Amino acid sequence: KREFERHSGSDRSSVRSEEKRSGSGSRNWGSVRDHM
Amino acid sequence: RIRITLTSRNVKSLEKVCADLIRGAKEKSLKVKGPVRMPTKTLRITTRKTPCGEGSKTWDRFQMRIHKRLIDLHSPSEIVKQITSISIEPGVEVEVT
Amino acid sequence: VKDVNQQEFVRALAAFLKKSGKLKVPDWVDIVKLAKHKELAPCDENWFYIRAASTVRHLYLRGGVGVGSMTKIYGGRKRNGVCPSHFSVGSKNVARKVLQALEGLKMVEKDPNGGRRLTPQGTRDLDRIAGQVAAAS
Amino acid sequence: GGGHVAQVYAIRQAISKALVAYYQKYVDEASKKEIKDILIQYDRTLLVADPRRCESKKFGGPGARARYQKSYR
Amino acid sequence: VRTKTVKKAARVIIEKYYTRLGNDFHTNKRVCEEIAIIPSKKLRNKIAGYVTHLMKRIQRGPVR
Amino acid sequence: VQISKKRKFVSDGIFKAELNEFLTRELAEDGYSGVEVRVTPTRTEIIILATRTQNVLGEKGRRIRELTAVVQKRFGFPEGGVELYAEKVATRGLCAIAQAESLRYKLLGGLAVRRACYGVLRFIMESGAKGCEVVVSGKLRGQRAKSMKFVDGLMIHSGDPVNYYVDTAVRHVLLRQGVLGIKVKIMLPWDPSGKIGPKKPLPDHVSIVEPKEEVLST
Amino acid sequence: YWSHPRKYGQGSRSCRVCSNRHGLIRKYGLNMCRQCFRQYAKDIGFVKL
Amino acid sequence: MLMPKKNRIAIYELLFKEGVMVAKKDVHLAKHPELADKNVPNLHVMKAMQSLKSCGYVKEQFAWRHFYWYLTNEGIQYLRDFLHLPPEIVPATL
RNA sequence: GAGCCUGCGGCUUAAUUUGACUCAACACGGGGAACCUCACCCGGCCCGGACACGGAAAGGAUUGACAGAUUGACGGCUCUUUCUCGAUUCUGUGGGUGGUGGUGCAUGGCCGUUCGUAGUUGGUGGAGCGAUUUGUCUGGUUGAUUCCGAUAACGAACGAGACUCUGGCAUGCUAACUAGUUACGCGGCCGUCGGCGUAACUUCUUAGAGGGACAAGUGGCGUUCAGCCACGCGAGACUGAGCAAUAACAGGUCUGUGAUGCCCUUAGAUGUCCGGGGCUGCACGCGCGCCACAAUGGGCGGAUCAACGUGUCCUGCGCCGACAGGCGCGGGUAACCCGUUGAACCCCGCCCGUGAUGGGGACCGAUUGAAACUAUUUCCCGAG
């Protein structure tokens, strides 16, 4: 097991969700979507 | 001589069928017997809620109410076909003997 | 029979069956244990005469009893070892031979509906033994 | 129905309410009310029925309240 | 402790009907069942329970 | 034959639970909304409720008879044991599964997700009285973790009346980037003795009639 | 040939929806997966009380 | 397949007379319910419809366990010149 | 802590598959796996590579075969061989299909959890340049932002409550030969009788609707309200359960799906059919449980008692048997038969007498459904 489970983890992974372009791309939404 | 049974799941549809059956036979002035109430049979299904393994051991126990109502009549079966033909109701099933 | 102790009745009735040696009392009466849930042999030598007394008494309360229904009466809590104990029926042969032993006397008869019931003579002796034990105290 | 103790407490209440109903239908209530106060003064369960029933079992442990042992870490 | 649904419905009864309701729970329950269409039977008794309680206050003095 | 009543009613539910699954995949684009069966010892009649009764049929009643030839071969019905009829609902603005199905081919035609959800929301308000809720996105994820909830108009979530006052429809739409879910919760208005909504009032509602205007006092 | 007798034991009974051999519910004549019976429980007539 | 000579003609004559076909997902069923006179397994009728489906003649839907095949106006004429029957025979659709 | 099976780690092994790892993994994936399940391993068949184009073409392209050998197999898949079948097949490059193969840190859906607590949100108006704030509260009360009130807020929407389900008591209504009861007749027995048969009836049984319970009366406390406490009368001053927001989690699930993206595999297959083994292998660690260490117990009689259940498969009776069982005769697709569910604990006698004993049991021929290897488990005896 682990003594501090709420930690970073891997090198390219984190405990919180992070995007590669902060929403923009071809696999996720979250980019500039204001005037639609 | 003929025993009419009423197999229904919802009581609202069951009580309405046995109502018109007594009235449907009253117009012929037949010595009919009162509707009896068979013991309600429920079907217990205790399933684990989680689809696979991970959970807190939560079971959801289903039930299925099956109601039975009998009505005994001693009358010839010559013209009872039309009496049952005017007893159409979805969800209920009549099995005359 | 209800106005007396059911244990004192079966003890007094056991002597009446042993007094008249018209029973069967098979050869294997002292080698077999009365049920698979029991472990040792009975302590009393004449257990067959006591079992036949209780067997004929149950027929007075309710008739139409066979061998499969008498082994349900004489059942117990079978110690399954490390496994939790459960209920296990008795032996069919020791119950059938008892019912056949009562057939030798004019106490029981086979009813057409199934099982075994009592005879007009069986209820006759059963009530007098209950009557003589009621006058004892 | 019931068990041994469930029946010995049932028949004592059955015959107690039996005499209080006979005196009500054919005799005066002064004779009926007299025998009701003497029975209730000793034990209330002799005439008043106990509506207590066995609660249903809930999953996660034996019986209704008790639960299985939880293992921490 | 009553809730807002019974509190609100109990006050409107007195504002519209005052020459018919009384100080008894069973009598006020009958008139409340007659004029008001309440779905639940337990909720109907909750409204009649608080309506009769306001009668002891109204007979004592005005209410806000 | 001569099976106990416990399994007799269970077999009836299986026949309905499976027949609905077949008509769900077949009449998805036609606007399927439900079926009603009449289990009778003479002719087990089963009718289909679709939003467009002209699309379920073929050229001249061709497709409606083609489906009857399939249900007879699956459950073993005779040549005249089941007859499928076409009947349309009163209005499409309150059938949850009809709206979830109508939202499927919209996203399959390259329509924007936001404009499609706002379109089906206004449709329920225009056709109906109580609001609804359309949730078409990825709920649990770390990259698709976009709830995108559109809730409005008297949304009930707890209690027993949550059954006969709001119906939920969960459908799926698979696309090039994955598969998306469609959760629609439409609430029906109160309609006495009508198929538009439930004929029973909410328990949290006490309507008081107006006081009698009796001027004839003496 | 190419037909092994399987009528008694785990392998002859399978779910009539997903063709699986785990979590079967064959009481009362259902023969459905435990993760699939919940999907059609409302259609069969089983409700939670 | 192995011997699709006397079986496929029996399948097509039933598929043309009745424009529907059902087959449970079971390759071990050696006796098809709609074709009992011939000891044709369920695999033969399932693989036969797999051929017509790939040719763009019939569409298939996947139920719980059974397959449902629906002929088209282009597939019926493909079976007309194959079965050697007049154009005056109509399937179970009408 | 001891004994033992079940789950986890580790070790070992051809493999000793795999998901999960504080509550929120570890009698969990109903996962109580002897084959099958099975995804793993050592090995043999199978195409179940449809459909598009060409090669090969009725002067045959092509699977099937105990003629022996071979082999795990009477598997024709290889050797030697005759053959009968007659354009579906075959070896080629494209493309399809199958997958319990990878990624749940691509996803749907579902469940668990935050989190059972009482907690959320916008409309208009007020404050601030603004993020935001008031409403959503000083006080009292309530399981409850539940109400009473205060009030730059007003009027409302989720949650709570209501509702649903279940338990509760009328010589009540509506009913009963698939439930009974009280009379009467008849028979047995010295009142007893689930012995038999038909007349009344619906208390008992079954279940339909509607009556009943609200802090309504009494008293006290509290600006008097909200309500709380005590007490008449009473079937209740009520019981358990279901449902359960907002927002969120790289929690679990690609292994439950013919939910599914991408990637991989695709004929010497990660497709699946069969045979064998493993998943059960052990110096050990952990967790959930069982049974005990008996004095309140154990051992043999007898004698009284049931609720939710289940049934094509449950059982009834005769016969045989140490019993597990076996041989016969019947009923029940069901308030009908099993069945008046004659259960254990408890009760009434006897035995044993604190001694690992008669407490506790590990481990060590007769059956039954198959394939009893690895002793599935039971039955008897012995060891214990």
Ligand SMILES: [Zn+2]
């Ligand atoms: Zn299934």
